[PDB]
Design a binder for this molecule. Structure first.
Ligand SMILES: CC[C@@H](c1ccc(O)cc1)C(c1ccc(O)cc1)c1ccc(O)cc1
Ligand SMILES: CC[C@@H](c1ccc(O)cc1)C(c1ccc(O)cc1)c1ccc(O)cc1
Lengths: 209, 9, 217, 10
């Protein structure tokens, strides 16, 4: 696939933004549980994912599901400063917060806003998270790394078409990927509280960690 | 468990 | 710091490198050696951090925050680096080299992840000049989103990394591809640190310094 | 206070 084709494939594969119906945690779990179903079908449409073995596809999803949920949350909350848009009907401020996770997500959202993160870049990062989060845990790894290299070329391709010099391209690429480290951090800490205070699908997701 | 069912079809 | 060239940036980092320390078994002794080793390494890490270009420019409050958030990451990437030329084994110290089987004393999940990272560094043929760059990035990045200057220094190290890759004869495609591959590994290092930290707070005689690092988390 | 605040300026 070309760089243009990579983006078009990812953009059209985007999951919908779902709505929501101890008080707060009931809603979020219900929301995440419905989102997980869409994430799975989204994962299949991510170029190169279904080429992997069924065993590997689940390991990747089991390790990255919360990261993918969180970066999605951070993304839709971009143009809503100081608040987290869990759903179009569920916009929460910091005060309504576990608040340590909220502050990190807000920081990431404000980080995306400062960087003017484009949707085309977002679907790349999200797909990168899916393929990367479980890869370090042989011919299949060569493939995953080949797809990752393809997504890297795609990211660079996007930045070059936006009039960025090759220095700014290389800087922005780094800036985007360094954020994935924070997203991993937020996920592990989120996972750490999720396992503390404990639907069907999400149980296999939580027990994986 | 569940996951290898949903993704299989 | 931002005034430094790429060659000068590398030279500063290479020269600021901490030494490879030595150490003085069961689940009690083994955690004892590592704790003793880590506590001595931390003292050198603090002095290394001070010598990291752009680090002393930060507030003394921020310097503490970055080190408190990244200390285990920095310890781990160092370990991974020293274990690079020792496949399937972890070189904690020249006199302390452990296999995976000797990891199940206490920690076996952590060992395989680190081994995976080490073989990943070797398969990528990670250069020392690249290593000192990644390590400094970990220091400046891991706590920056949990507080403007830092992002500029980070950009400087990015320029520095590319410079190394460009001077090694890699095409502009392989440069940004290799750049991406290196930074994605930092995601796993962060993961290992988080998994390690919850395990450290589970078991915790730690020193004052190593204890104060843990409550930060 | 914290140990770390001494090592970093001394
Ligand atoms: C940020 C809130 C996040 C969360 C995670 C872990 C925590 O400990 C607290 C909060 C939450 C969520 C994130 C993204 C998204 O699209 C929907 C919901 C969530 C996920 C799973 C879950 O079983 C319950 C809640
Ligand atoms: C990989 C072993 C790592 C570890 C961390 C947490 C675990 O639960 C088990 C193992 C270990 C270490 C890493 C790097 C290094 O240079 C020296 C030592 C360590 C650090 C601090 C500490 O109080 C005890 C042990």
């Amino acid at each position: 696939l070309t760089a243009d084709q990579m983006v078009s494939a990812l953009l059209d594969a985007e999951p919908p933004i779902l709505y929501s119906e101890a008080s707060m945690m009931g809603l979020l779990t219900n929301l995440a549980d419905r989102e997980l179903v869409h994430m799975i079908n989204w994962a299949k449409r991510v170029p190169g994912f279904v080429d992997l073995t069924l065993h590997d596809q689940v390991h990747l999803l089991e390790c990255a599901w919360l990261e993918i949920l969180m970066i999605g949350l951070v993304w839709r909350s971009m143009e809503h400063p100081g608040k987290l848009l869990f759903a179009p009907n569920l916009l929460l401020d910091r005060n309504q917060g576990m608040v340590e996770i909220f502050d990190m997500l807000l920081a990431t959202s404000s980080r995306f806003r400062m960087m003017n993160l484009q949707g085309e870049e977002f679907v790349c990062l999200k797909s990168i998270i899916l393929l990367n989060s479980g890869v370090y845990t042989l011919e299949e790894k060569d493939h995953i790394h080949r797809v990752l290299d393809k997504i890297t070329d795609t990211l660079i391709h996007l930045m070059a078409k936006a009039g960025l010099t090759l220095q700014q391209q290389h800087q922005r690429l780094a800036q985007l990927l360094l954020i994935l480290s924070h997203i991993r951090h937020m996920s592990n800490k989120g996972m750490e509280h999720l396992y503390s205070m404990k639907s069907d699908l999400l149980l296999e997701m939580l027990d994986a960690h | 468990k569940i996951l290898h069912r949903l993704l299989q079809d």
